[PDB]
Write a protein that holds these residues in place. Structure first.
Motif, mmCIF file in Angstrom:
data_model
loop_
_atom_site.group_PDB
_atom_site.id
_atom_site.type_symbol
_atom_site.label_atom_id
_atom_site.label_comp_id
_atom_site.label_asym_id
_atom_site.label_seq_id
_atom_site.Cartn_x
_atom_site.Cartn_y
_atom_site.Cartn_z
ATOM 1 N N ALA A 138 0.806 -1.194 0.000
ATOM 2 C CA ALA A 138 0.000 0.000 0.000
ATOM 3 C C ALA A 138 0.845 1.252 0.000
ATOM 4 O O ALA A 138 0.728 2.101 -0.910
ATOM 5 N N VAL A 161 -0.826 4.502 -1.156
ATOM 6 C CA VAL A 161 -2.027 4.334 -0.340
ATOM 7 C C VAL A 161 -1.597 4.249 1.136
ATOM 8 O O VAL A 161 -0.807 3.373 1.498
ATOM 9 N N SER A 187 -6.234 4.403 4.366
ATOM 10 C CA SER A 187 -7.197 3.626 3.635
ATOM 11 C C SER A 187 -7.324 2.194 4.161
ATOM 12 O O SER A 187 -8.313 1.569 3.902
ATOM 13 N N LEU A 221 -8.273 -2.512 -2.546
ATOM 14 C CA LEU A 221 -7.627 -1.218 -2.306
ATOM 15 C C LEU A 221 -7.094 -0.592 -3.570
ATOM 16 O O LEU A 221 -6.515 0.500 -3.521
#
Ligand SMILES: *[C@@H]1O[C@H](CO)[C@@H](O[C@@H]2O[C@H](CO)[C@@H](O[C@@H]3O[C@H](CO)[C@@H](O)[C@H](O)[C@@H]3O)[C@H](O)[C@H]2NC(C)=O)[C@H](O)[C@H]1NC(C)=O
Ligand SMILES: [Ca+2]
Ligand SMILES: [Zn+2]
Ligand SMILES: [Zn+2]
Length: 783
Positions: free
Chosen positions: A208, A213, A246, A447
């Motif tokens: 991520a 993210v 997130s 995601l």
């Protein structure tokens, strides 16, 4: 030097500056006022009517003041008690067709709610004990169970969840381990585990961050009460858009701790399960307060189950070994054995093999462990492994606990849970059991991330999701087969083989004909590496014959429910026939087998299942022969003469694909030629480490295997090619008392075989490729 304004901050300060984050307690590095300012306990975790609209008092654990949303530090029941709203759990399920996210949210967040030691069967406790969990389970998407990785311990499984990798590949092969390159040991307790050197692969929080993210801090010091972990997640979800994560993780030590103390089916288990439910309810109420209950994807998942295990079910190594002071044992529900000082591993194994009638463990060199465990290819895995029977412990030398886990991952009591809830998961949908290595791809999908390379099969869980970011594609064949004719004459061969008229009058002998339609029901397997091989057709079977390994890579054949079994007549017992389609030089020879005193041979297609006495002669072609130890022939001949016909009788016909596996470096992958460490003596015929079979039939058993309209049904195995049957303690009995039990231990997924052979199966069916990927990941467990 103060935690004021900084409690559970996401930025990580120091060294040496004093920290105020999730993990500061674990390092004993928190600021002096951390425990004071951040671990506030006053008045508990629930608003009461008398607090509604209170002046903010900072010492309160959570708040019921009008300013409490601006921080998201309100108690989770605040709106219910003060603003007349309802509890999430009392609301009807309503389908979430699209994410319903509030201002500032640019993707649906993901929350992973991991519960330690949550056995699959605890879900059978129902909505009187776990109302919130049963609502997530019934309105969302759920499996009856999720299979953990071996060993079924917490560190290996939580890290597998995080990475999509087997423990052998990610490095966390136990809760305890020793690394001979670091000369250091890793334990649940202490500082060593915090050193990055131990942790391989690429966990989801790093995937991520690398793709832009933001991830929350997945780990929680044990001192943080569960209520404060939930409130901290809700606080982070209230942060500005450029600081908000997130993806989030909540971890609970329950029900594992109570499972250990009282056993899995103790009446004491109900309270811990009620408390876990309360926590979920707090999370859902909290999300609903923030208008995120129809926006967030939530994953409720366990890491492993729990079995009944007590003190007096302990085997002691000192009762088998006379030199127990020479070894170091990692003990418990599995065993790993190492020398105390860098003893003889072959004498250790022999001394632990079938010594007592009720012996409750079995020793293995790691390369002989069932391949489905994928538990060999790491220097942290000791050469000697004890697979321990369920309900038992093994200890080195000679009750407060009643439960444990760590056993074989196909054992029923080790299975755990999976529920997915939110806009991206399906609605009120049940899905088949699946393995925990598959979730990392799905969490990535959820995601918008590209997964790092992993052991999942991307697309095999598309059926959990309402909308998919990833559509799989079937790999391109690398090597194209030759289809050689009857080119050569009998007299051109001298392979040292013998045999003992009508095949001269059959012009169409060995032509395609109807062989492809009836014996390859799902298309030719594709070869995914560079090699040269030949398709060979016969009345009863078809095969892909490797000109490099001098044997088939695969042999395919169909047996109907009504197939007759016949004997190899005595005049043909030693028969081997030269194959007029393949050259002498690319053929095996019988002389090498006669020179090799330890080695015999068998056949991939069983002569026992020939359709006629004429067709039986095909089974004795030199291109259908494979090298087999006499000990292993006991297993193979029973499989071929007795069990294939049984499966055909039970399943309304079966299609079988059988072949050799070479995995001398125990990495779970097809060996190259350079890696083959054993050949038939004086020869260039490689010795397989294993033999596989994939047994397919119609899931609807009212249709025969060759006339199947719909979903398929498969079981497979990967049998170790061993020169003795020491693994099977009953092997001196009739094969009917032990062979099938052996094969069930060595059950396998089709995917396992694909990796070990470089073959791709099921390329021509009426099913979608996603459905096929689900089939290829299926494990028949016999539990
Ligand atoms: C489970 O998944 C992991 C990750 O995909 C697989 O491990 C990977 O195995 C490959 C092939 O052995 C390794 O890649 C190799 O890299 C070098 C060049 O750097 C080269 O020698 C090869 O041509 C190849 O590219 C890779 O190191 C490795 N990755 C990790 C994280 O370990 C593993 O094979 C999988 N296991 C099974 C049973 O499928
Ligand atoms: Ca290999
Ligand atoms: Zn655990
Ligand atoms: Zn535990």
């Amino acid at each position: 030097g103060s935690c004021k304004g900084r409690c559970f901050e996401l930025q990580e300060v120091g060294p040496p500056d004093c920290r105020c984050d999730n993990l500061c307690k674990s390092y004993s590095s928190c600021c002096h006022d951390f425990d004071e300012l951040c671990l506030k306990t006053a008045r508990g975790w629930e608003c009461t009517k008398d607090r509604c609209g209170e002046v903010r008092n900072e010492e309160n654990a959570c708040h019921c003041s009008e300013d409490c949303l601006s921080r998201g530090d309100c108690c989770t029941n605040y709106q219910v008690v003060c603003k007349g709203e309802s509890h999430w759990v009392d609301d009807d399920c309503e389908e979430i067709k699209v994410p319903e996210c509030p201002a500032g949210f640019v993707r649906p967040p993901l929350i992973i709610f991991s519960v330690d030691g949550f056995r699959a069967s605890y879900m059978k406790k129902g909505s009187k004990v776990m109302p919130n969990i049963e609502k997530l389970r019934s309105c969302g998407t759920h499996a009856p169970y999720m299979r953990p990785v071996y060993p079924t311990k917490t560190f290996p499984n939580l890290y597998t969840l995080a990475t999509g990798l087997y423990p052998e590949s990610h490095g966390i092969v136990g809760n305890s381990m020793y690394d001979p390159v670091f000369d250091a040991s890793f334990h649940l307790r202490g500082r060593e585990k915090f050193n990055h050197r131990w942790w391989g692969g690429q966990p989801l929080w790093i995937t991520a961050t690398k793709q832009g993210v933001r991830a929350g801090t997945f780990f929680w010091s044990v001192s943080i009460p569960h209520e404060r972990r939930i409130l901290t997640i809700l606080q982070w979800l209230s942060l500005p858009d450029n600081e908000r994560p997130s993806v989030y993780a909540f971890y609970s030590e329950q029900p594992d701790f109570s499972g250990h103390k009282y056993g899995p089916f103790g009446p004491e288990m109900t309270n811990p399960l009620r408390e876990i439910d309360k926590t979920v309810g707090q999370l859902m109420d909290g999300l609903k307060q923030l208008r995120l209950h129809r926006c967030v994807n939530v994953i409720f998942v366990g890491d492993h189950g729990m079995e009944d295990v007590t003190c007096d079910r302990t085997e002691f190594l000192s009762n088998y070994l006379t030199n127990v002071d020479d070894i170091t044992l990692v003990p418990g529900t599995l065993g790993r054995i190492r020398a105390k000082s860098i003893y003889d591993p072959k004498t250790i194994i022999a001394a632990l093999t079938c010594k007592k009638p009720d012996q409750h463990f079995k020793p293995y060199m790691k390369q002989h462990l069932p391949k489905r465990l994928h538990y060999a290819n790491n220097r942290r895995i000791e050469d000697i492994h004890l697979l321990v029977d369920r309900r038992w412990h093994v200890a080195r030398k000679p009750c407060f606990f009643q439960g444990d886990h760590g056993f074989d991952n196909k054992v029923n009591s080790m299975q755990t849970v999976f529920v997915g809830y939110g806009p991206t998961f399906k609605y009120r949908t049940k899905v088949p059991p699946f393995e925990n290595i598959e979730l990392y791809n799905v969490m990535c999908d959820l995601l918008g991330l590209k997964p790092a390379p992993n052991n999942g099969t991307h697309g095999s869980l598309n059926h959990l999701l309402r909308t998919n970011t990833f559509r799989p594609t079937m790999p391109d064949e690398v090597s194209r087969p030759n289809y050689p004719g009857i080119m050569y004459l009998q007299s051109e061969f001298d392979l040292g083989c013998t045999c003992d008229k009508l095949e001269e009058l059959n012009k169409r002998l060995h032509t395609k004909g109807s062989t492809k339609e009836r014996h390859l029901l799902y298309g030719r397997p594709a070869v995914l590496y560079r090699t040269s091989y030949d398709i060979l057709y016969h009345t009863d079977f078809e095969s892909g014959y490797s000109e490099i390994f001098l044997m088939p890579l695969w042999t395919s054949y169909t047996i109907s429910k009504q197939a007759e079994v016949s004997s190899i007549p005595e005049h043909l017992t030693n028969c081997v026939r030269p194959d007029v389609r393949v050259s002498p030089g690319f053929s095996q020879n019988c002389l090498a087998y006669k020179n090799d005193k330890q080695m015999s041979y068998g056949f991939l297609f069983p002569p026992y299942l020939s359709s006629s006495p004429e067709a039986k002669y095909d089974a004795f072609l030199v291109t259908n022969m494979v090298p087999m130890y006499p000990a292993f022939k006991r297993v193979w001949a029973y499989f071929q003469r007795v069990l294939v016909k049984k499966y055909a009788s039970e399943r309304n016909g079966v299609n079988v694909i059988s072949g050799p596996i070479f995995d001398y470096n125990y990495d779970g992958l097809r060996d190259t030629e350079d890696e083959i460490k054993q050949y038939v003596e004086g020869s260039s015929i490689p010795v397989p480490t294993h033999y596989y079979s994939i047994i397919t039939s119609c899931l609807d058993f009212t249709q025969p295997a060759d006339k199947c309209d719909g979903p398929l049904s498969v079981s497979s195995f990967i049998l170790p090619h061993r020169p003795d049957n020491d693994e099977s303690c009953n092997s001196s009995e009739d094969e009917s008392k032990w062979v099938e039990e052996l094969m069930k231990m060595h059950t396998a997924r089709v995917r396992d075989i694909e990796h070990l052979t470089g073959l791709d199966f099921y390329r021509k069916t009426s099913r979608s490729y996603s459905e096929i990927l689900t089939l290829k990941t299926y494990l028949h467990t016999y539990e």
